[PDB]
Amino acid sequence: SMHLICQSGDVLSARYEIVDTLGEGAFGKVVECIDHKAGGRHVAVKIVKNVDRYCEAARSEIQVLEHLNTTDPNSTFRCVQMLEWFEHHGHICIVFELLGLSTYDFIKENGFLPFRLDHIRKMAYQICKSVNFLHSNKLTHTDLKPENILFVQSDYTEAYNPKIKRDERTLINPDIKVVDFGSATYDDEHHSTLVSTRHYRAPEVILALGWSQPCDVWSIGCILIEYYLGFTVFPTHDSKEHLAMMERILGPLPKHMIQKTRKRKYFHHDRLDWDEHSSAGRYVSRACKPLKEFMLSQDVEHERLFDLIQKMLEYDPAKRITLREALKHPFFDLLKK
Ligand SMILES: Nc1ncnc2c1c(I)cn2[C@@H]1O[C@H](CO)[C@@H](O)[C@H]1O
């Protein structure tokens, strides 16, 4: 059991002393450690469950990272640096540079308040650039979400905010890196139709129409909205409900995608088989609404962000904006000189 080897004070590989837990996922956990063979430098160690599927994903992640960290040794494109890996009591352990809080945890610890728009702009730009780098190297991440975007330094300043009537944390440096390459898939590898359920899943994934780089762009759209609102606009883990939410926010799915899907169960006469008047249906109607109605201001920068988000949430992955195009969107003009 992981609990036997992941506690504060334990030593891994005769080297890494566990300080505390940084975070957890399906795979196991990530712990901060003091590296006694590198002068006491603190690092992050990802301790992977001794379970086939996660061992496999960990081996894949290692191969992806060897490739990315070799192609981009200075982390210009902001993928986390893997320092090494080892085994410990049958657990794969991957050692990474220590980063700050995930963008998820920062939001959580700031009372679910959104990020300020200028930070959203910088972070969005970096995410697009980082993931575009992956896209340039024939990779799709597939598991982009706020937990997998981390601040390089999550240090903040804190003031009372009269407008919200609560104390607010403001981030000092919004620079990020992307983590978790355990699902990342190369173009020449099999893109399994089977993908497991998230808030950040693209419609082509849910409908098993095949996926590739565009599914990442969808996820990034979901992320940006969450950064803007402080909460997710797809809070479900049921697929059909997810599709009903999409329809409420973005309009009906394209007929041609509905026609092509193997997932006939969701539909009836090429319309989503969804009772709006069920208790779940009434929840979807009242919680979800057309995308633009989530805007907190009509100011032009808000309108620019939402225009980009809308393009990232194009249903048809063949028509969805690419990250290469996203990087030229007007929302990013303020970052250029
Ligand atoms: N290198 C790192 N430095 C600091 N924290 C890290 C990492 C990595 I790799 C992951 N995490 C934390 O663990 C959570 C699940 O991966 C993430 O969501 C995050 O909270």
mmCIF file of C-alpha atoms and ligand atoms in Angstrom:
data_model
loop_
_atom_site.group_PDB
_atom_site.id
_atom_site.type_symbol
_atom_site.label_atom_id
_atom_site.label_comp_id
_atom_site.label_asym_id
_atom_site.label_seq_id
_atom_site.Cartn_x
_atom_site.Cartn_y
_atom_site.Cartn_z
ATOM 1 C CA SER A 1 0.000 0.000 0.000
ATOM 2 C CA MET A 2 1.178 3.546 -0.873
ATOM 3 C CA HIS A 3 0.330 4.830 2.650
ATOM 4 C CA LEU A 4 3.230 2.634 3.895
ATOM 5 C CA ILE A 5 5.877 4.493 1.884
ATOM 6 C CA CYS A 6 4.621 8.083 1.287
ATOM 7 C CA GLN A 7 4.657 9.586 4.813
ATOM 8 C CA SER A 8 6.511 12.624 6.144
ATOM 9 C CA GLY A 9 10.059 11.673 7.152
ATOM 10 C CA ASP A 10 10.279 8.532 4.934
ATOM 11 C CA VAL A 11 13.383 8.272 2.754
ATOM 12 C CA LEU A 12 13.056 7.165 -0.877
ATOM 13 C CA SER A 13 15.935 5.585 -2.841
ATOM 14 C CA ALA A 14 18.324 6.400 0.040
ATOM 15 C CA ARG A 15 18.161 10.030 -1.043
ATOM 16 C CA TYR A 16 14.776 11.833 -1.056
ATOM 17 C CA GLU A 17 13.309 12.667 2.347
ATOM 18 C CA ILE A 18 9.550 13.254 2.238
ATOM 19 C CA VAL A 19 8.448 16.653 3.576
ATOM 20 C CA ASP A 20 4.732 16.635 2.715
ATOM 21 C CA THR A 21 2.111 15.802 0.076
ATOM 22 C CA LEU A 22 1.764 18.362 -2.755
ATOM 23 C CA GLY A 23 -1.159 16.683 -4.448
ATOM 24 C CA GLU A 24 -2.935 13.499 -5.456
ATOM 25 C CA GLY A 25 -4.454 11.997 -8.602
ATOM 26 C CA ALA A 26 -5.796 8.714 -9.841
ATOM 27 C CA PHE A 27 -2.184 7.628 -10.349
ATOM 28 C CA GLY A 28 -1.050 8.035 -6.738
ATOM 29 C CA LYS A 29 0.469 11.162 -5.177
ATOM 30 C CA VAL A 30 3.064 13.826 -5.511
ATOM 31 C CA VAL A 31 5.243 14.628 -2.502
ATOM 32 C CA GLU A 32 7.770 17.327 -1.844
ATOM 33 C CA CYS A 33 11.137 15.905 -0.867
ATOM 34 C CA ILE A 34 14.506 17.095 0.270
ATOM 35 C CA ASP A 35 17.153 15.627 -2.078
ATOM 36 C CA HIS A 36 20.042 14.755 0.253
ATOM 37 C CA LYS A 37 22.344 13.880 -2.685
ATOM 38 C CA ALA A 38 21.776 17.266 -4.448
ATOM 39 C CA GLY A 39 22.657 19.516 -1.531
ATOM 40 C CA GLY A 40 19.225 19.508 0.099
ATOM 41 C CA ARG A 41 17.404 20.887 -2.954
ATOM 42 C CA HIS A 42 13.641 20.403 -2.677
ATOM 43 C CA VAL A 43 12.003 18.381 -5.461
ATOM 44 C CA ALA A 44 8.629 16.880 -6.296
ATOM 45 C CA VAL A 45 8.354 13.130 -6.440
ATOM 46 C CA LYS A 46 5.454 11.499 -8.119
ATOM 47 C CA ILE A 47 4.816 8.140 -6.451
ATOM 48 C CA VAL A 48 2.777 5.917 -8.741
ATOM 49 C CA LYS A 49 0.437 3.168 -7.563
ATOM 50 C CA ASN A 50 1.616 -0.369 -8.052
ATOM 51 C CA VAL A 51 -1.267 -1.069 -10.449
ATOM 52 C CA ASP A 52 -0.768 -2.040 -14.079
ATOM 53 C CA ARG A 53 -2.617 0.770 -15.801
ATOM 54 C CA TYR A 54 -0.756 3.453 -13.752
ATOM 55 C CA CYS A 55 2.636 1.756 -14.063
ATOM 56 C CA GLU A 56 2.057 1.762 -17.839
ATOM 57 C CA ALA A 57 1.049 5.427 -17.906
ATOM 58 C CA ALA A 58 4.105 6.282 -15.794
ATOM 59 C CA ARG A 59 6.461 4.494 -18.174
ATOM 60 C CA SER A 60 4.775 6.419 -21.071
ATOM 61 C CA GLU A 61 5.117 9.721 -19.195
ATOM 62 C CA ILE A 62 8.843 9.068 -18.686
ATOM 63 C CA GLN A 63 9.319 8.462 -22.442
ATOM 64 C CA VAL A 64 7.364 11.645 -23.347
ATOM 65 C CA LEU A 65 9.340 13.723 -20.890
ATOM 66 C CA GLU A 66 12.733 12.396 -22.079
ATOM 67 C CA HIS A 67 11.715 13.569 -25.522
ATOM 68 C CA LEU A 68 10.307 16.989 -24.514
ATOM 69 C CA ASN A 69 13.079 17.803 -21.995
ATOM 70 C CA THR A 70 15.714 16.831 -24.632
ATOM 71 C CA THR A 71 14.018 18.883 -27.420
ATOM 72 C CA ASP A 72 13.546 21.858 -25.082
ATOM 73 C CA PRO A 73 16.251 21.640 -22.362
ATOM 74 C CA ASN A 74 15.635 25.212 -21.128
ATOM 75 C CA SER A 75 11.885 24.698 -20.878
ATOM 76 C CA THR A 76 11.199 27.608 -23.247
ATOM 77 C CA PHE A 77 7.834 25.966 -23.929
ATOM 78 C CA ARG A 78 7.120 25.407 -20.220
ATOM 79 C CA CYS A 79 6.784 21.662 -19.850
ATOM 80 C CA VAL A 80 7.827 20.466 -16.408
ATOM 81 C CA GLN A 81 11.453 19.161 -16.100
ATOM 82 C CA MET A 82 11.815 15.523 -15.095
ATOM 83 C CA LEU A 83 15.043 15.036 -13.142
ATOM 84 C CA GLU A 84 15.085 11.225 -12.913
ATOM 85 C CA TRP A 85 13.024 8.178 -11.979
ATOM 86 C CA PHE A 86 13.484 5.080 -9.743
ATOM 87 C CA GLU A 87 11.523 2.271 -8.123
ATOM 88 C CA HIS A 88 10.699 2.064 -4.507
ATOM 89 C CA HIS A 89 9.049 -0.993 -3.019
ATOM 90 C CA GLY A 90 7.589 -1.757 -6.434
ATOM 91 C CA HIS A 91 6.368 1.858 -7.026
ATOM 92 C CA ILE A 92 7.564 3.896 -9.941
ATOM 93 C CA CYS A 93 8.714 7.248 -8.630
ATOM 94 C CA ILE A 94 9.361 10.179 -10.943
ATOM 95 C CA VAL A 95 11.376 13.137 -9.697
ATOM 96 C CA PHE A 96 10.432 16.600 -11.039
ATOM 97 C CA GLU A 97 11.503 20.146 -10.407
ATOM 98 C CA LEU A 98 9.473 21.557 -7.587
ATOM 99 C CA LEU A 99 6.770 23.980 -8.774
ATOM 100 C CA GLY A 100 4.172 25.988 -6.810
ATOM 101 C CA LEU A 101 0.445 25.492 -6.411
ATOM 102 C CA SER A 102 -1.688 24.230 -9.297
ATOM 103 C CA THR A 103 -3.940 26.878 -10.768
ATOM 104 C CA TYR A 104 -6.777 24.783 -9.357
ATOM 105 C CA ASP A 105 -5.384 24.919 -5.820
ATOM 106 C CA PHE A 106 -4.644 28.601 -6.043
ATOM 107 C CA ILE A 107 -8.291 29.266 -6.995
ATOM 108 C CA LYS A 108 -9.506 26.951 -4.243
ATOM 109 C CA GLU A 109 -7.346 28.588 -1.587
ATOM 110 C CA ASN A 110 -8.461 32.053 -2.721
ATOM 111 C CA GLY A 111 -12.079 31.141 -1.910
ATOM 112 C CA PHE A 112 -12.956 30.207 -5.521
ATOM 113 C CA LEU A 113 -12.403 33.707 -6.805
ATOM 114 C CA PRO A 114 -11.434 33.934 -10.457
ATOM 115 C CA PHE A 115 -8.111 35.220 -11.779
ATOM 116 C CA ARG A 116 -7.826 38.829 -12.870
ATOM 117 C CA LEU A 117 -8.041 39.266 -16.637
ATOM 118 C CA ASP A 118 -4.458 40.423 -17.194
ATOM 119 C CA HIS A 119 -3.242 37.228 -15.460
ATOM 120 C CA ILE A 120 -5.674 35.123 -17.452
ATOM 121 C CA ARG A 121 -4.152 36.664 -20.588
ATOM 122 C CA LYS A 122 -0.563 35.796 -19.615
ATOM 123 C CA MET A 123 -1.469 32.319 -18.423
ATOM 124 C CA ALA A 124 -3.598 31.588 -21.496
ATOM 125 C CA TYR A 125 -0.778 32.697 -23.748
ATOM 126 C CA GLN A 126 1.720 30.417 -21.974
ATOM 127 C CA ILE A 127 -0.668 27.444 -21.985
ATOM 128 C CA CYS A 128 -1.298 27.876 -25.688
ATOM 129 C CA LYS A 129 2.363 28.190 -26.426
ATOM 130 C CA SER A 130 3.268 25.167 -24.295
ATOM 131 C CA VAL A 131 0.587 22.919 -25.681
ATOM 132 C CA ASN A 132 1.264 24.195 -29.197
ATOM 133 C CA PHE A 133 4.836 22.944 -28.700
ATOM 134 C CA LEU A 134 3.364 19.535 -27.952
ATOM 135 C CA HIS A 135 1.169 19.803 -31.015
ATOM 136 C CA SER A 136 4.305 20.634 -33.053
ATOM 137 C CA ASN A 137 5.962 17.478 -31.856
ATOM 138 C CA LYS A 138 3.087 15.172 -32.819
ATOM 139 C CA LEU A 139 1.631 14.973 -29.327
ATOM 140 C CA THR A 140 -1.757 15.440 -27.798
ATOM 141 C CA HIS A 141 -1.848 15.900 -24.004
ATOM 142 C CA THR A 142 -5.490 14.810 -23.593
ATOM 143 C CA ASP A 143 -5.696 15.677 -19.865
ATOM 144 C CA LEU A 144 -5.421 19.432 -19.676
ATOM 145 C CA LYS A 145 -7.132 20.880 -16.621
ATOM 146 C CA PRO A 146 -6.366 23.444 -13.963
ATOM 147 C CA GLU A 147 -4.770 20.779 -11.718
ATOM 148 C CA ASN A 148 -2.244 20.209 -14.493
ATOM 149 C CA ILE A 149 -1.243 23.796 -14.925
ATOM 150 C CA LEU A 150 1.095 24.893 -12.091
ATOM 151 C CA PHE A 151 2.558 28.211 -11.162
ATOM 152 C CA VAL A 152 6.299 28.297 -11.221
ATOM 153 C CA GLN A 153 5.941 30.364 -8.021
ATOM 154 C CA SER A 154 2.538 30.661 -6.394
ATOM 155 C CA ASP A 155 3.581 33.471 -3.990
ATOM 156 C CA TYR A 156 0.926 36.184 -3.580
ATOM 157 C CA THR A 157 0.086 39.545 -1.935
ATOM 158 C CA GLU A 158 -3.108 39.875 0.172
ATOM 159 C CA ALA A 159 -5.509 42.843 0.610
ATOM 160 C CA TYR A 160 -9.107 43.480 1.685
ATOM 161 C CA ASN A 161 -11.253 44.023 -1.375
ATOM 162 C CA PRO A 162 -14.169 46.473 -0.682
ATOM 163 C CA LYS A 163 -15.975 45.421 -3.908
ATOM 164 C CA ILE A 164 -16.165 41.688 -2.921
ATOM 165 C CA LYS A 165 -16.194 42.356 0.866
ATOM 166 C CA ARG A 166 -13.506 39.615 1.505
ATOM 167 C CA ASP A 167 -9.633 39.390 1.581
ATOM 168 C CA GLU A 168 -8.151 38.551 -1.794
ATOM 169 C CA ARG A 169 -4.911 36.960 -2.835
ATOM 170 C CA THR A 170 -3.150 38.406 -5.823
ATOM 171 C CA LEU A 171 -0.515 36.447 -7.546
ATOM 172 C CA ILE A 172 2.953 38.019 -7.821
ATOM 173 C CA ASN A 173 4.186 36.045 -10.832
ATOM 174 C CA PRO A 174 1.591 34.298 -13.003
ATOM 175 C CA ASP A 175 4.129 32.189 -15.022
ATOM 176 C CA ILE A 176 3.061 28.517 -15.419
ATOM 177 C CA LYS A 177 4.179 25.103 -16.535
ATOM 178 C CA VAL A 178 2.252 22.182 -17.851
ATOM 179 C CA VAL A 179 2.444 18.784 -16.037
ATOM 180 C CA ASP A 180 1.161 15.238 -16.223
ATOM 181 C CA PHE A 181 2.184 13.544 -19.413
ATOM 182 C CA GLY A 182 0.784 10.160 -18.375
ATOM 183 C CA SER A 183 -1.988 10.260 -21.056
ATOM 184 C CA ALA A 184 -0.066 12.145 -23.723
ATOM 185 C CA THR A 185 -0.322 10.317 -27.001
ATOM 186 C CA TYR A 186 1.795 10.459 -30.162
ATOM 187 C CA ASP A 187 0.132 10.739 -33.587
ATOM 188 C CA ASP A 188 1.526 7.310 -34.579
ATOM 189 C CA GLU A 189 0.191 5.572 -31.459
ATOM 190 C CA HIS A 190 -3.285 4.213 -31.217
ATOM 191 C CA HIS A 191 -5.769 6.892 -30.159
ATOM 192 C CA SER A 192 -8.067 4.752 -28.091
ATOM 193 C CA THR A 193 -11.787 5.486 -28.529
ATOM 194 C CA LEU A 194 -11.961 4.480 -24.882
ATOM 195 C CA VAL A 195 -11.206 7.617 -22.873
ATOM 196 C CA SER A 196 -12.208 8.000 -19.206
ATOM 197 C CA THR A 197 -14.733 10.721 -18.063
ATOM 198 C CA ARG A 198 -13.819 14.452 -17.284
ATOM 199 C CA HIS A 199 -15.205 18.014 -17.301
ATOM 200 C CA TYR A 200 -12.592 18.904 -19.924
ATOM 201 C CA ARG A 201 -13.536 16.198 -22.503
ATOM 202 C CA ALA A 202 -14.231 17.377 -26.038
ATOM 203 C CA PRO A 203 -17.422 16.398 -27.854
ATOM 204 C CA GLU A 204 -15.525 14.201 -30.362
ATOM 205 C CA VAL A 205 -14.140 12.236 -27.388
ATOM 206 C CA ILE A 206 -17.516 11.791 -25.736
ATOM 207 C CA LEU A 207 -19.026 10.680 -29.061
ATOM 208 C CA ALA A 208 -16.084 8.449 -29.925
ATOM 209 C CA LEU A 209 -15.505 10.061 -33.302
ATOM 210 C CA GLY A 210 -11.730 9.921 -32.991
ATOM 211 C CA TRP A 211 -9.576 12.622 -31.511
ATOM 212 C CA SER A 212 -6.249 14.302 -31.868
ATOM 213 C CA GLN A 213 -4.743 17.738 -31.152
ATOM 214 C CA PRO A 214 -8.041 19.581 -31.340
ATOM 215 C CA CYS A 215 -9.362 17.892 -28.187
ATOM 216 C CA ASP A 216 -6.668 19.802 -26.287
ATOM 217 C CA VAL A 217 -7.956 23.098 -27.647
ATOM 218 C CA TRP A 218 -11.395 22.290 -26.293
ATOM 219 C CA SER A 219 -9.889 21.610 -22.891
ATOM 220 C CA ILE A 220 -8.007 24.837 -22.908
ATOM 221 C CA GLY A 221 -11.290 26.680 -23.642
ATOM 222 C CA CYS A 222 -12.851 25.046 -20.615
ATOM 223 C CA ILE A 223 -9.837 25.981 -18.508
ATOM 224 C CA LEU A 224 -9.956 29.622 -19.519
ATOM 225 C CA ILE A 225 -13.614 29.922 -18.595
ATOM 226 C CA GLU A 226 -12.906 28.396 -15.240
ATOM 227 C CA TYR A 227 -10.125 30.891 -14.684
ATOM 228 C CA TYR A 228 -12.560 33.672 -15.607
ATOM 229 C CA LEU A 229 -15.443 32.505 -13.419
ATOM 230 C CA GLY A 230 -13.672 30.620 -10.612
ATOM 231 C CA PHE A 231 -15.886 27.585 -11.288
ATOM 232 C CA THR A 232 -16.523 25.068 -14.055
ATOM 233 C CA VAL A 233 -19.386 25.449 -16.437
ATOM 234 C CA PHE A 234 -19.547 21.589 -16.932
ATOM 235 C CA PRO A 235 -19.944 20.271 -13.388
ATOM 236 C CA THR A 236 -20.977 16.673 -14.121
ATOM 237 C CA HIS A 237 -19.401 13.239 -14.622
ATOM 238 C CA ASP A 238 -22.358 11.843 -16.621
ATOM 239 C CA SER A 239 -21.735 11.953 -20.382
ATOM 240 C CA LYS A 240 -25.289 12.568 -21.489
ATOM 241 C CA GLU A 241 -25.724 15.367 -18.946
ATOM 242 C CA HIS A 242 -22.453 16.817 -20.195
ATOM 243 C CA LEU A 243 -23.849 16.886 -23.683
ATOM 244 C CA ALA A 244 -27.050 18.550 -22.404
ATOM 245 C CA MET A 245 -24.898 21.184 -20.724
ATOM 246 C CA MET A 246 -22.955 21.770 -23.925
ATOM 247 C CA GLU A 247 -26.218 22.286 -25.807
ATOM 248 C CA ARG A 248 -27.467 24.781 -23.257
ATOM 249 C CA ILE A 249 -24.228 26.777 -23.440
ATOM 250 C CA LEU A 250 -23.184 26.412 -27.068
ATOM 251 C CA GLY A 251 -26.365 25.367 -28.943
ATOM 252 C CA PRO A 252 -27.255 22.021 -30.542
ATOM 253 C CA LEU A 253 -24.555 19.622 -31.732
ATOM 254 C CA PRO A 254 -23.807 19.399 -35.433
ATOM 255 C CA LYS A 255 -26.122 16.876 -37.134
ATOM 256 C CA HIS A 256 -23.218 15.306 -38.986
ATOM 257 C CA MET A 257 -21.423 14.448 -35.702
ATOM 258 C CA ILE A 258 -24.666 13.069 -34.248
ATOM 259 C CA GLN A 259 -25.081 10.943 -37.403
ATOM 260 C CA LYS A 260 -21.523 9.559 -37.317
ATOM 261 C CA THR A 261 -21.324 8.575 -33.638
ATOM 262 C CA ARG A 262 -21.314 4.943 -32.580
ATOM 263 C CA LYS A 263 -22.832 6.131 -29.228
ATOM 264 C CA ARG A 264 -26.464 5.777 -30.317
ATOM 265 C CA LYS A 265 -27.621 5.540 -26.672
ATOM 266 C CA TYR A 266 -27.355 9.325 -26.161
ATOM 267 C CA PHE A 267 -29.729 10.146 -29.044
ATOM 268 C CA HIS A 268 -33.164 9.631 -30.470
ATOM 269 C CA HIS A 269 -34.117 10.775 -33.990
ATOM 270 C CA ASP A 270 -30.769 12.559 -34.194
ATOM 271 C CA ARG A 271 -31.590 14.733 -31.150
ATOM 272 C CA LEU A 272 -30.131 14.375 -27.669
ATOM 273 C CA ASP A 273 -32.275 11.999 -25.613
ATOM 274 C CA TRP A 274 -32.594 14.386 -22.689
ATOM 275 C CA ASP A 275 -35.623 15.141 -20.528
ATOM 276 C CA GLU A 276 -35.372 18.880 -19.773
ATOM 277 C CA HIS A 277 -38.235 18.475 -17.264
ATOM 278 C CA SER A 278 -36.512 15.775 -15.127
ATOM 279 C CA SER A 279 -34.883 16.993 -11.891
ATOM 280 C CA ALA A 280 -31.447 16.672 -13.611
ATOM 281 C CA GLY A 281 -32.847 18.521 -16.648
ATOM 282 C CA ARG A 282 -34.143 21.401 -14.530
ATOM 283 C CA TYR A 283 -30.702 21.621 -12.884
ATOM 284 C CA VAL A 284 -28.995 21.846 -16.324
ATOM 285 C CA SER A 285 -31.405 24.580 -17.523
ATOM 286 C CA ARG A 286 -30.934 26.754 -14.474
ATOM 287 C CA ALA A 287 -27.175 26.231 -14.030
ATOM 288 C CA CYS A 288 -26.146 26.484 -17.650
ATOM 289 C CA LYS A 289 -26.829 29.263 -20.094
ATOM 290 C CA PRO A 290 -25.511 30.601 -23.391
ATOM 291 C CA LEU A 291 -21.760 31.168 -23.245
ATOM 292 C CA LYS A 292 -21.801 34.957 -23.571
ATOM 293 C CA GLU A 293 -24.206 35.349 -20.677
ATOM 294 C CA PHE A 294 -21.321 34.297 -18.358
ATOM 295 C CA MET A 295 -19.434 37.512 -19.195
ATOM 296 C CA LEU A 296 -18.878 39.703 -16.136
ATOM 297 C CA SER A 297 -18.350 42.843 -18.193
ATOM 298 C CA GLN A 298 -18.984 44.073 -21.703
ATOM 299 C CA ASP A 299 -15.550 45.749 -21.882
ATOM 300 C CA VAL A 300 -13.663 44.930 -25.099
ATOM 301 C CA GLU A 301 -10.967 42.723 -23.436
ATOM 302 C CA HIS A 302 -13.690 40.567 -22.001
ATOM 303 C CA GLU A 303 -15.284 40.364 -25.434
ATOM 304 C CA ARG A 304 -11.968 39.389 -26.945
ATOM 305 C CA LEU A 305 -11.390 36.617 -24.317
ATOM 306 C CA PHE A 306 -14.908 35.251 -24.965
ATOM 307 C CA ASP A 307 -14.396 35.325 -28.721
ATOM 308 C CA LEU A 308 -11.297 33.121 -28.295
ATOM 309 C CA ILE A 309 -13.114 30.806 -25.837
ATOM 310 C CA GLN A 310 -16.017 30.444 -28.255
ATOM 311 C CA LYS A 311 -13.621 29.486 -31.024
ATOM 312 C CA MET A 312 -11.914 26.934 -28.759
ATOM 313 C CA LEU A 313 -15.368 25.470 -27.999
ATOM 314 C CA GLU A 314 -16.304 24.942 -31.635
ATOM 315 C CA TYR A 315 -18.032 21.544 -31.690
ATOM 316 C CA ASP A 316 -16.500 20.255 -34.895
ATOM 317 C CA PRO A 317 -12.835 19.529 -34.252
ATOM 318 C CA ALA A 318 -12.015 20.035 -37.948
ATOM 319 C CA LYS A 319 -13.268 23.671 -37.677
ATOM 320 C CA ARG A 320 -11.939 24.407 -34.190
ATOM 321 C CA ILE A 321 -9.204 27.034 -33.893
ATOM 322 C CA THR A 322 -5.706 25.656 -33.683
ATOM 323 C CA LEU A 323 -3.302 26.845 -31.021
ATOM 324 C CA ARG A 324 -1.057 28.281 -33.693
ATOM 325 C CA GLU A 325 -3.971 30.573 -34.730
ATOM 326 C CA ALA A 326 -5.026 31.095 -31.096
ATOM 327 C CA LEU A 327 -1.630 32.624 -30.418
ATOM 328 C CA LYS A 328 -2.437 35.420 -32.996
ATOM 329 C CA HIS A 329 -5.859 36.198 -31.524
ATOM 330 C CA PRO A 330 -6.481 39.869 -30.520
ATOM 331 C CA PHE A 331 -6.889 38.897 -26.860
ATOM 332 C CA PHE A 332 -3.087 38.504 -26.847
ATOM 333 C CA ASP A 333 -2.282 41.871 -28.589
ATOM 334 C CA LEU A 334 -1.719 43.534 -25.196
ATOM 335 C CA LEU A 335 1.212 41.137 -24.619
ATOM 336 C CA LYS A 336 3.035 42.250 -27.776
ATOM 337 C CA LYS A 337 5.167 45.384 -28.471
HETATM 338 N N1 LIG B 1 6.384 19.259 -10.060
HETATM 339 C C1 LIG B 1 5.429 19.478 -9.175
HETATM 340 N N2 LIG B 1 5.632 20.395 -8.213
HETATM 341 C C2 LIG B 1 4.646 20.642 -7.362
HETATM 342 N N3 LIG B 1 3.439 20.098 -7.307
HETATM 343 C C3 LIG B 1 3.240 19.179 -8.246
HETATM 344 C C4 LIG B 1 4.184 18.813 -9.205
HETATM 345 C C5 LIG B 1 3.577 17.795 -9.964
HETATM 346 I I1 LIG B 1 4.529 16.710 -11.456
HETATM 347 C C6 LIG B 1 2.327 17.606 -9.485
HETATM 348 N N4 LIG B 1 2.110 18.426 -8.435
HETATM 349 C C7 LIG B 1 0.882 18.474 -7.659
HETATM 350 O O1 LIG B 1 0.306 17.188 -7.694
HETATM 351 C C8 LIG B 1 -1.000 17.253 -8.284
HETATM 352 C C9 LIG B 1 -1.284 15.996 -9.049
HETATM 353 O O2 LIG B 1 -0.296 15.760 -9.993
HETATM 354 C C10 LIG B 1 -0.971 18.517 -9.109
HETATM 355 O O3 LIG B 1 -2.286 18.931 -9.386
HETATM 356 C C11 LIG B 1 -0.166 19.441 -8.211
HETATM 357 O O4 LIG B 1 -0.966 19.954 -7.169
#
